[PDB]
Design a protein around this nucleic acid. Sequence first.
RNA 1: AAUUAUAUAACUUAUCUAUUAUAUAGUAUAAGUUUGAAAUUUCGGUUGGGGUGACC
RNA 2: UCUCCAGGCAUACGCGUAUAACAACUCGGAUAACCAUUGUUAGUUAAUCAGAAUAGGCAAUAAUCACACUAUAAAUUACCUAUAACUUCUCUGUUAACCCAACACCGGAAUGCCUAAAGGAAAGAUCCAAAAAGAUAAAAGGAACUCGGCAAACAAGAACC
RNA 3: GAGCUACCUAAAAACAAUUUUAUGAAUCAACUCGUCUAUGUGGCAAAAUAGUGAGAAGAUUUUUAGGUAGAGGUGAAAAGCCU
Lengths: 77, 46, 242, 72, 227, 122
Amino acid sequence: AYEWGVRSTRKPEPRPLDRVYEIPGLEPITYEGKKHFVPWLARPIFPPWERGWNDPRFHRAAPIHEQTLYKEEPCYI
Amino acid sequence: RARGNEYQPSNIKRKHKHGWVRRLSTPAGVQVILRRMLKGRKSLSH
Amino acid sequence: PLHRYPVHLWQKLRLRQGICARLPAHFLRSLEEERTPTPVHYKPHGTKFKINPKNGQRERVEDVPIPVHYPPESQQGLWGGEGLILGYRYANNDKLSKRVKKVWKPQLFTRELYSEILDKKFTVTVTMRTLDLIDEAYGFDFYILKTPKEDLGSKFGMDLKRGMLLRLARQDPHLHPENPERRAAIYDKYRSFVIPEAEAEWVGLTLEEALEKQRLLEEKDPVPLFKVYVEELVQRLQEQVL
Amino acid sequence: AWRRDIFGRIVWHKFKQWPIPWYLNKRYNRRRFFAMPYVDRFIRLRIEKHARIEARKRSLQKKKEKILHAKF
Amino acid sequence: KFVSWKSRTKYTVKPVKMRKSGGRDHTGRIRVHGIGGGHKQNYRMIDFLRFRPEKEKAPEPFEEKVVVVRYDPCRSADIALVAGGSRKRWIIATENMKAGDTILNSNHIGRMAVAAQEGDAHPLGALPVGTLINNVESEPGRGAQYIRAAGTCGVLLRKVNGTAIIQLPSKRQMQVLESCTATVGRVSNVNHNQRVIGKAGRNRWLGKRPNSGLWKIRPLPPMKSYV
Amino acid sequence: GADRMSKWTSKRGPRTFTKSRGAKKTGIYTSDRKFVQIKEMVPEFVVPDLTGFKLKPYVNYRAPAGIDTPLTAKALFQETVAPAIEKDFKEGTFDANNLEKYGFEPTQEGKLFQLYPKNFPR
RNA sequence: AAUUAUAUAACUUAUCUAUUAUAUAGUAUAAGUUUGAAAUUUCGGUUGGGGUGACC
RNA sequence: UCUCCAGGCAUACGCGUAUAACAACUCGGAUAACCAUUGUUAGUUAAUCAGAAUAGGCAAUAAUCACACUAUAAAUUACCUAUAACUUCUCUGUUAACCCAACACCGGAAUGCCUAAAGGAAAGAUCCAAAAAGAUAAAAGGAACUCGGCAAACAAGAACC
RNA sequence: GAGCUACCUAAAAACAAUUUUAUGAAUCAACUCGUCUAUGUGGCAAAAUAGUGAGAAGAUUUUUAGGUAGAGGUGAAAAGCCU
Ligand SMILES: [Mg+2]
Ligand SMILES: [Mg+2]
Ligand SMILES: [Mg+2]
Ligand SMILES: [Mg+2]
Ligand SMILES: [Mg+2]
Ligand SMILES: [Mg+2]
Ligand SMILES: [Mg+2]
Ligand SMILES: [Mg+2]
Ligand SMILES: [Mg+2]
Ligand SMILES: [Mg+2]
Ligand SMILES: [Mg+2]
Ligand SMILES: [Mg+2]
Ligand SMILES: [Mg+2]
Ligand SMILES: [Mg+2]
Ligand SMILES: [Mg+2]
Ligand SMILES: [Mg+2]
Ligand SMILES: [Mg+2]
Ligand SMILES: [Mg+2]
Ligand SMILES: [Mg+2]
Ligand SMILES: [Mg+2]
Ligand SMILES: [Mg+2]
Ligand SMILES: [Mg+2]
Ligand SMILES: [Mg+2]
Ligand SMILES: [Mg+2]
Ligand SMILES: [Mg+2]
């Protein structure tokens, strides 16, 4: 069951979330207001970003299954 | 052999070894700049 | 030349000028005060006097705490005041032998602990001392609330205190929802620690975190001077009409 | 905005126009607006260096007025 | 700055370009001496899990066709391209494998012994005691790790209950479950041990830097006047 | 022996090193290295008609100069906004909500020329 | 050579878990023992000069 | 115009105005002429030379005139499936006798083309002493020299530890 | 501090003519090296010059960028090399 791809070359897992987030009812203090990273404040969580319009140079396609021409039956080309 | 010509100039090598971006990469290099700023050097880095 | 103030007073003068001055008075008191943590790695002298055996006379005794190194990994767990003792030893326990570097390390375990006020179970790095303190305090929630910052010695622990204090202060109905009776019992059990809402918010904040909080609170975009002059003109016109 | 650089000084930072928000730019996040503690000694050395210059500057003006008063 | 070249996640039969180490590790320091230079090479992704059913197919014995038996720069043995269904995968070739041969890959654990034909992959339980085997896996599903060199064949000494004993080429006896899959036959290039390097330059073609030129029982007290 | 004091420019270094002299970009580089100039990105010089213009580069030495009174927000507000509000207040047709009537803009978004952040050059 | 040596390696007793009928397992640590990668320090005196001896 | 010598022209890397004209004649060239020096003014022009959209699927078959021919050290974005956009020329490198060796250093310095059509000057004037360095010739002899055939030779062959 | 040097990684280059063969083969350029003698000895040169020599399709040579750092690195061991 040898698996290709040595672990060192894989993208690293996201850093563990700050423990202040675990505590319920507590509003973390993060560096969002400063608009830059600092090591001694908590890391913000941002919602997904939407440009509000389509920029042709940075178009990103939908996944395979969401394509209009997706068909479950396979076609051999 | 004749010595004295150990310097083979190369701008790519120079800016990579002693440049601004290189000095800021590690905290010890940042302190190299801090010393030179305190001394008053006109050239902080290559 | 000379500085006007001794260097040890510089931190106090910094807290007393600028945005630091505008920070809450109660919060500054926690910053200002320094209290020795309860002894952990040394035996304190029971008395203030002892009888010297060699000369048989009474001489004063004082407690000098050992220097203990607290790795940053400790701030993400609940060590009960324990830390690393970085010191030296004498080989063979004779001072005429070589002096050797020695480090004494705490025995760390991973344990899962339940907080009633938060109604959540946390997995924490802990020492056997920390478990004993909780037992002596008759509850995990009692341990965090009773223990002071200096004894607690953990940023994770201090954040737990703020959440618990904030939970009690607001009587948040988010605890065990649909069970007011069960909730009521929990809040009643810990009623001794209830404090005003404003104070509880600033509990356990570091100086940098406190400063960012204060900056956010007073952050405000400028008022278009069109409105400001309009207010002045209306007031003058209204006053003249009076 | 007013920001502190990696050398421990307070400098006004002029903003730039970008098409993406700051938390998504990777060229912006390499820039550091904080100083690590190893800068603290250098912060004090600047204050003491500046204090020496100003003290010398005051002393000289006092000496110069003595020359004026003796001359006039 | 050392980034390992072994960064390809997906299996392919296309040869993959290798970056050489030089005996140095990610730190940049020599960890093994005597490795350096040599000929440039390409890595052909071998597949040592013989019974890998094709995607979206049932788990039962299948057959594959041998396209070509080829020289491999990266190992002592030789490799065989094998095709079955819609899949091509490199595999290690046995002593007698030729192009156009057919080789079975069986999951069924024969209650009785199954006649052994070289090149077919069978669980150790199926094979009879004494059969020469190669490409043995320690645990079911792991993949072959032992007896993978040229002309190296181990024997299956014994089978009792759910486990069997394997005599590795070093004569070291190992024990594995009878469910483990072992290929039959020798591993090919049996004469690899007969090869002669001849000239010092040939080892410098295989990436073998020269050896360096640098040229314990404490007596007990009662036996120190006799040392 | 390299010169540490002179400015780093594109004339120095190997061919691969290139950098600009401060000229603003006017286009985009697509893949396969095609430059696409954008018409809107190229500045347009708005020049007025100077026919019948009475003002020339220099002024009479006989012309009296004026006392400097740099413009202030109060002076601008009094000259422009005070006359309307004062008259309207007497008429009683005044409220805080309708400050736009006198020229106030609650937000700069949507305007071609925004006063902050400035989005137009001199 | 003298003094050390949580370099690696091993065991032993605790500590902490699992289990089990007391018991065999493991182990973010402490205390021992064994091994010794290393570290620190030194090179008494008198004897045409060098072996050994000797002598103080 | 004559006499004679025989690595030159490009690019890369590097250097950073040493480029060219004029005017100067202090400093710099190890001296003069003249300028490589000082001051002033100029210069290197490029859509071809040179530099700087997204997501999936998949690869057995070297090179060497690549045919034959064997071989061993086993060896270089494409093509498809969908999505998106639906007429564009700005920016920068461009000079020289040049760089690394404290110097206008008998040294070091990658590649392509070519070998004199390109590029150059060994002698400031005079004098022909010793000693010193180099080249050429040698009556008769031919290692007698010398630690040793070192160096040289109209020699450069043969053998043995 | 590895622009010298030691070793390495990646991407690139160069090898005419002649004879053997099918090559760490031969003669001999370019190129790499530095055997012996003389000159030089503050020299043209902090290791050169002039001759004479060794290799010259390979464990060859060269170019560019990267790596390993002093309790260390590198070493076909000379305690060599690391401006
Ligand atoms: Mg030098
Ligand atoms: Mg070089
Ligand atoms: Mg040996
Ligand atoms: Mg000129
Ligand atoms: Mg002139
Ligand atoms: Mg000039
Ligand atoms: Mg081009
Ligand atoms: Mg030119
Ligand atoms: Mg000279
Ligand atoms: Mg000519
Ligand atoms: Mg001449
Ligand atoms: Mg003459
Ligand atoms: Mg002669
Ligand atoms: Mg003669
Ligand atoms: Mg004689
Ligand atoms: Mg003789
Ligand atoms: Mg001779
Ligand atoms: Mg190098
Ligand atoms: Mg040839
Ligand atoms: Mg040869
Ligand atoms: Mg030869
Ligand atoms: Mg030869
Ligand atoms: Mg070597
Ligand atoms: Mg030796
Ligand atoms: Mg040196």
